[PDB]
């Protein structure tokens, strides 16, 4: 019961590199968070890990807004439910909503109710994603062999689509549950622009246009 925290710090750093890789303002001095500060902060009296302690909020860079001028507010919850049931669930959304979340990022122990489930998709035009802490101790993303993978803005997508001749029906696409576009909560009509790690220029990257 101490690897534990070390996992849950873990998860918490790769939440906040996935939140600084999709645009909003995140220092890398955060991510790298040390253990002990960690256990510092966000552990009681005890040395127990207080997850209603870590949850965030987020805002979009000054480079991210002047591209993406819609983009807003994102909301960082780890609830501190083992199995998340409909009241807990609700209890998020409300908050996402009356907080005028645009994004709300839940992580969650164990399993998600049935009931709790149906309520992701209840509060339009916010959009609510879920992740398992597990699947958070380790950034998929930074492995090697998968190449960076970066969100264009709508003014760089119709000047890609002008540049090639093409319609945007015409460039190679990327699956919605893609584990990478589920990373990156793509959407669907958005295009990334991808860049191979062996490569060192963004020069000539790869395109694919998300369904």
């Known amino acids: 019961n101490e690897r534990n925290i070390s996992r849950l710090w873990r998860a918490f750093r790769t939440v906040k590199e996935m939140v600084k890789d999709r645009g909003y303002f995140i220092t890398q001095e955060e991510v790298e968070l040390p253990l002990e500060d960690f256990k510092a902060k966000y552990c009681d009296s005890m040395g127990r890990p207080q997850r209603k302690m870590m949850s965030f909020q987020a ?17 960082v919850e780890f609830c501190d439910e ?42 339009p035009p916010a959009t609510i994603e879920t992740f398992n802490e597990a699947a958070l101790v380790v ?19 119709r000047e890609l689509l002008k540049r090639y001749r093409l319609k945007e029906s015409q460039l190679p696409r ?38």
């Open 174 to 211: 990327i699956q919605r549950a893609d584990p990478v576009a589920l990373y990156l909560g793509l959407k669907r009509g958005e295009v990334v622009k991808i860049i191979r790690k062996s490569e060192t220029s963004g020069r000539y990257a790869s395109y694919r246009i998300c369904m």
């Open 59 to 75: 805002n979009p860079t000054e480079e991210s807004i002047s591209k993406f001028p819609d983009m807003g507010s994102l909301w």
């Open 139 to 157: 950034n998929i993303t930074h492995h090697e062999l998968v190449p960076k993978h970066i969100r264009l803005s709508s003014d760089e997508k």
């Open 82 to 123: 083992p199995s998340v049931g409909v009241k807990t669930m609700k209890t998020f959304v409300i908050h996402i909503q009356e907080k005028n979340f645009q994004t709300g990022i839940f992580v969650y122990q164990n399993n998600i109710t049935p009931s709790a489930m149906k309520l992701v998709p209840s509060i």
